[PDB]
Design a binder for this molecule. Structure first.
Ligand SMILES: *[C@@H]1O[C@H](CO)[C@@H](O[C@@H]2O[C@H](CO)[C@@H](O)[C@H](O)[C@H]2NC(C)=O)[C@H](O)[C@H]1NC(C)=O
Ligand SMILES: *[C@@H]1O[C@H](CO)[C@@H](O[C@@H]2O[C@H](CO)[C@@H](O)[C@H](O)[C@H]2NC(C)=O)[C@H](O)[C@H]1NC(C)=O
Ligand SMILES: *[C@@H]1O[C@H](CO)[C@@H](O)[C@H](O)[C@H]1NC(C)=O
Ligand SMILES: *[C@@H]1O[C@H](CO)[C@@H](O)[C@H](O)[C@H]1NC(C)=O
Ligand SMILES: *[C@@H]1O[C@H](CO)[C@@H](O)[C@H](O)[C@H]1NC(C)=O
Ligand SMILES: *[C@@H]1O[C@H](CO)[C@@H](O)[C@H](O)[C@H]1NC(C)=O
Ligand SMILES: *[C@H]1O[C@H](CO)[C@@H](O)[C@H](O)[C@H]1NC(C)=O
Ligand SMILES: *[C@H]1O[C@H](CO)[C@@H](O)[C@H](O)[C@H]1NC(C)=O
Ligand SMILES: [Ca+2]
Ligand SMILES: [Ca+2]
Ligand SMILES: [Cl-]
Ligand SMILES: [Cl-]
Ligand SMILES: [Zn+2]
Ligand SMILES: [Zn+2]
Ligand SMILES: [Zn+2]
Ligand SMILES: [Zn+2]
Lengths: 689, 689
């Protein structure tokens, strides 16, 4: 078949050569090297035979360290004397433009104060410090370990607590894998390395200065002081050797339980302040600059021969913090190999039914900026014509098995294609990827099917799925979560994401990265070429039954209040019931369609394409204009995680502590009512008359 | 042709019999008689052969007088003694349930104070009273004449001024036609009759308690105190005999110029207070009740044989204040005759290409409630599938010539169809409606084409056009505006809108109402049956060039400020230029389409259908979530009137008096930027690749 030719044409050795070619130098967004990489990708796409490959630019707010006012953290004594102050991988000694560690969009400042350790700086950590312990963060400098929630939420949480700065660091408890050596001898995080990353709280907005509209040359911009999601205290990241020095002499209360204690050789006392030392106060000095900077997406097409006005988007970012060998360059290499293989199909006369859009996004590391501004530019065509979005970010975050996150519309297609891709796993040489994946990660809901996760947030699919309602999917290799308990991967967002890391320690044969390229490519092919779009709406109906039961279960602890405030989930369950009926009836009709009647086929394809759109509410969620998906929009507590019925969940979260209960419960009623309506409206789009 | 059979089948005598049958008794929304009328319409549609005809209900906030606490206005002396107090057409003496005059959704109260005459209670009238004259309305009762702006805006304006009540009345200057007798001898307004009407400021929201979502049984409702657009002072309407008594002894400043002086035999002095009288203070007593009440739309279909998933909506309200012989029942009768004529086509085996939706809306007089709640329910299917909406409200507001208001997409179709409909005008017996209309109302932009107006607001097309972006149109007979200078028509919204009025004084032969039914029906037929949707996008391009020039001209008075604040219209003109190019290229391609290739035809039809949608911004306009059309959304000063580039216009209005100029001009820049983007995005939907 054509799909087998697409998949079998891709080669591990090609992914390896692409990765090596794109990881020799840093390619930070907004810098010359990442523009040069765009031009190289565009030349390659033209060579592969794509119909177009253009650079599309935007001018967006980025953030960089000041090369002549370096950031640092220090400890001073009571006489203001500096007692301690903070200060390339082998083979890259000659590389001159590695950005030092920083947290993009930090406020500027030189705050000084007593230090308080805040664990993960989650909402519950601050609740505990303030409510239980009676500790006052006003005004203190807090130190938090990375993990559990997106780093921007840690900063927002610290701001809410009156902290005047926040230090972030990587605890070996969370980022150091047991019995593996630190880079370069193994793949673990060294004590000298800090994790870069932006600290905006954008909630899907894109460029901070132009929420809702693409950042073109003429475009109105907010004043920088009003930029969406920009924090108002300094934030800076350090490695664990430096963190150990800061934590060592914290006094005050002992860590409250083992869940506060990391792995360094220190007490994990909370503070505030020091005991047993010259160590008296902590200072931060952070002076990164925000500047409007041009960024460049590469956007290419293969136009459909039958439905050129219907799109499947294969999009991945290419900007990195340093070399980004895993994040994102492993996905950049995969995207090139996919485009090469579609070009080989074209060379023998194939053209797809619908149009494929290839996209290499810029400035993802600064808040999904390139992918979001292109969605904002092209919203009117994208919302009326897009079948799906398949991401192409990191392909290789571990080497145990496949992970897939996607809308329930795509579950059946994912299971179908993974059965036709050879497994790359040792011991599965005559078996498919489906078989190895089912063995290694069975679904809790059905032991006979592999696990597929919800799509949440934190990579370029976000605006397409959570704002525009375009069915989306991602797939990558990952770690074994039952045994591997560290966050992300050890060298995430550090200078040590190198080609050598990936080749030596992750996937020496490149077979695992090949399997991810084959699946992302086969997903695009089947969505763009199948006469009938390969979605299954009954799988959405079953997902909604699970999510309704879950939010309802969460409400049982408040059962008396539900009764007293006249709160009922009846309408939600009724909508779910009606959706399941409409989806069953829709599939009964769909098998009867006359495949030789183009308008009959196109009307049913429109219903499959527009089903995800029905869940988008243009009013958004409370305080979040750009999160519109009523089933799947984000975790308010961790942007990386997806949350179901977010309007209901946010309304009921910590409700027992809301000042005004009558008001709080009416908000729960509001969001229940919205979810019921939206699911009923979605069911209505499936009806025949 | 089929269109000629549709048009020639309609009969004046049938419209007359329908009108007489629907105007014997009052049919106020929410009352038994208007439910009975729904059932009669539904029985008729089934008899005519429609595929379906169903009642669709919602439970919405309505407002009625308290039958046991009657409203009134009084004058008292300084001893609190009542000196004056306010208190059926021939042949209707036995009709028992005529609602007395009131303004629906008025606050309740018994305010007492000095009286101030405020002309039309426009923003500029209050500016003059307060800024120029130094008059303080705090706290006064104001009296305003109806006209110039929607009555709800008069009330909002008075509230802003600190007034504690507002009396509305019909001045003969505005509602009494020269040399015609008062009903029953002629068609003029008697001094005893008051104009009913709601006084909400909904800005497109629909039911006040459920903005954004249909008002079903389970639906979350705002507390009534928080109902959208509900005014916070009492409001009540009186006839001019009563107004004369209230105005007569006003003292204080003389009317400032003739534009403040109406036609009664009084001075039109402003007050505050009385001079020359027992007349000391004015009191209002208003105790209407707001109550959630069930309303019923009748919704019927004729399903398409080729594109059943594409819709053309013919919708008109049927609820009236009393008999509503003009408003809306003349349109109710027209809608029935149209449905009858489509049923006759069906009887000979015809079926339309696309689906026609017929709708008889309820509670239009209470804020467009039935049509808006059905749009809110069905938004997901309507926005993805609707070709157009044709209204069917009053057909006969005068007897001089045709008036058409529609999107520029429909201009060419309107001109084409009116050439094939016989003129009903005396002296035009062998001529078409186009010819009589061109002679009587030529367009200012092109003397060789008849005038077509912008669609604004104030009838059931509003949510479809201004929220959802569905191309809309309306047509009716009207007065000669160069000679007839009165507002609306004299007996508008009074008890004197009777069948006898229409038959004796407006259209005895029913030929004018017939011509309106033929045009509304022919519009539906051509939109639903033509293989290629009959829109012209180059007419939209020319309209945008006119609107860009107009808003720019308006800015010239502020030219120095534009320069000082770096405000430019360059991007707007550039977007308009690009749209005109894209529309020209689109039509060049459209004439080449292979009419025998269904997918080629369907892709171009999708572009014609979705063009109006491109102008809808889900973020809305400032303070108005439900006005989304960036070119055509409303006048903030008069909901009946449409305003172009409303975001730019509202931003620049009264700007010289804004407290903060730097902030005010940035808002102008914002709205210019949004308009430029939106027109460019719309152009992008027309592009081939
Ligand atoms: C699910 O569909 C059912 C059937 O159409 C709806 O049930 C109606 O519910 C209302 C109360 O909300 C009752 O007045 C009707 O009697 C019900 N009809 C039947 C046949 O049971 C139900 O409302 C729909 N659910 C939602 C959320 O719209
Ligand atoms: C109208 O289309 C033109 C042509 O594509 C756009 O012109 C570009 O404008 C930007 C400045 O905004 C310049 O950087 C480019 O050099 C222009 N190109 C050309 C060929 O003139 C214009 O931006 C579009 N208008 C809008 C509002 O999008
Ligand atoms: C970088 O820091 C130096 C030293 O404070 C300062 O003078 C310079 O202006 C900074 N650069 C920018 C863009 O702020
Ligand atoms: C890769 O797989 C090998 C072989 O099982 C294992 O020893 C190693 O820890 C894995 N590497 C990573 C980064 O997980
Ligand atoms: C009507 O007014 C009477 C007299 O004030 C009052 O008692 C009654 O409750 C009112 N009806 C309603 C629904 O308020
Ligand atoms: C209707 O037309 C007649 C004949 O021209 C005219 O005398 C009369 O004023 C018109 N009626 C109305 C209500 O305008
Ligand atoms: C800590 O919190 C309280 C209440 O927020 C605040 O009044 C106080 O100023 C804070 N502490 C200090 C030391 O200022
Ligand atoms: C009229 O306006 C001023 C300013 O709004 C207000 O202070 C005053 O109270 C008002 N007049 C009266 C009589 O209260
Ligand atoms: Ca933007
Ligand atoms: Ca509503
Ligand atoms: Cl990915
Ligand atoms: Cl109308
Ligand atoms: Zn990434
Ligand atoms: Zn990253
Ligand atoms: Zn009307
Ligand atoms: Zn009316």
């Amino acid at each position: 078949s054509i799909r087998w030719k697409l998949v079998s044409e891709m080669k591990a050795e090609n992914i390896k050569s692409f990765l090596r070619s794109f990881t020799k130098l840093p390619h930070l967004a907004g810098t010359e090297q990442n523009f040069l990489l765009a031009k190289k990708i565009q030349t390659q796409w033209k060579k592969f035979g794509l119909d177009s490959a253009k650079l599309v630019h935007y001018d967006v707010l980025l953030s960089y360290p000041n090369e002549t006012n370096a950031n640092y953290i220090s400890i001073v004594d009571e006489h203001e004397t500096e007692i301690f102050k903070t200060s390339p991988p082998d083979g890259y000694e000659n590389v001159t433009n590695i950005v030092p560690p920083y947290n993009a969009f930090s406020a500027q400042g030189m705050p000084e104060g007593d230090l308080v350790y805040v664990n993960y700086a989650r909402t519950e950590d601050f609740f505990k410090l303030e409510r239980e312990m009676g500790i006052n963060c006003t005004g203190k400098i807090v130190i938090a370990r990375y993990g559990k929630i997106f780093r921007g939420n840690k900063v927002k949480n610290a701001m809410l607590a009156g902290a005047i700065g926040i230090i972030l660091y990587s605890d070996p408890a969370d980022y150091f894998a047991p019995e593996v050596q630190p880079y370069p001898k193994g793949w673990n995080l060294p004590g000298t390395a800090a994790q870069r990353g932006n600290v905006l709280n954008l909630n899907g907005a894109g460029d901070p200065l132009t929420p809702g509209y693409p950042a073109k040359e003429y475009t109105f911009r907010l004043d920088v002081e009003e930029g969406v999601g920009i924090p108002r205290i300094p934030v800076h990241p350090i490695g664990y050797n430096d963190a150990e020095i800061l934590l060592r002499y914290l006094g005050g209360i002992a860590p409250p339980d083992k869940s506060w204690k990391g792995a360094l050789n220190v007490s994990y006392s909370i503070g505030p302040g020091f005991t047993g030392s010259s160590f008296r106060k902590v200072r931060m000095h952070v002076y990164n600059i925000n500047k409007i900077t041009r960024i460049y997406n590469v956007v290419g097409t293969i136009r459909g021969s039958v439905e050129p006005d219907r799109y499947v988007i294969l999009g991945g970012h290419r900007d990195s913090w340093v070399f980004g060998a895993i994040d994102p360059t492993s996905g950049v290499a995969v995207l090139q190999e996919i485009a090469r293989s579609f070009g080989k199909l074209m060379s023998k006369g194939w053209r797809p039914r619908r149009t494929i859009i290839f996209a290499s996004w810029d400035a993802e590391e600064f808040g999904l900026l390139g992918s979001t501004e292109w969605a904002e530019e092209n919203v009117k065509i994208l919302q009326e014509r897009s079948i799906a979005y398949i991401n192409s970010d990191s392909s290789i975050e571990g080497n145990y098995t496949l992970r897939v996150d996607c809308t329930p519309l795509l579950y059946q297609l994912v299971y179908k294609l993974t059965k036709e891709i050879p497994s790359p796993d040792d011991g599965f040489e005559s078996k498919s990827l489906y078989e190895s994946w089912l063995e290694k990660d069975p679904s809790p809901e059905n032991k006979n099917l592999p696990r597929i996760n919800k799509l949440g947030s934190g990579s370029d699919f976000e605006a397409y799925f959570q704002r525009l309602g375009i069915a989306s999917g991602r797939a990558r290799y990952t770690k074994n979560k039952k045994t591997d308990k560290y966050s992300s991967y050890p060298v995430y967002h550090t200078i040590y994401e190198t080609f050598e890391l990936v080749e030596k320690f992750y996937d020496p044969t490149f077979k695992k990265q090949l399997s991810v390229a084959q699946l992302r490519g086969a997903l695009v092919y089947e969505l763009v070429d199948s006469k009938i779009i390969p979605f299954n709406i009954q799988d959405y109906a079953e997902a909604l039954k699970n999510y309704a039961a879950s939010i309802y279960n969460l409400s049982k602890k408040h059962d008396q209040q539900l009764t007293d405030h006249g709160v009922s989930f009846d309408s939600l369950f009724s909508a779910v019931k009606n959706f399941s009926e409409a989806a069953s009836d829709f599939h009964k009709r769909l098998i009867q369609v006359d495949l030789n009647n183009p308008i009959a086929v196109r009307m049913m394809n429109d219903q499959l394409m527009l089903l995800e759109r029905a869940f988008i509410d243009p009013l958004g969620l409370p305080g979040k204009l750009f999160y519109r998906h009523i089933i799947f929009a984000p975790s308010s507590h961790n942007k990386y995680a997806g949350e179901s019925f977010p309007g209901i969940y946010d309304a009921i979260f910590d409700i027992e502590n809301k000042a005004n209960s009558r008001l709080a419960w009416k908000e729960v009623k509001k969001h229940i009512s919205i979810a019921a309506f939206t699911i009923q409206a979605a069911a209505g789009t499936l009806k025949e008359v």
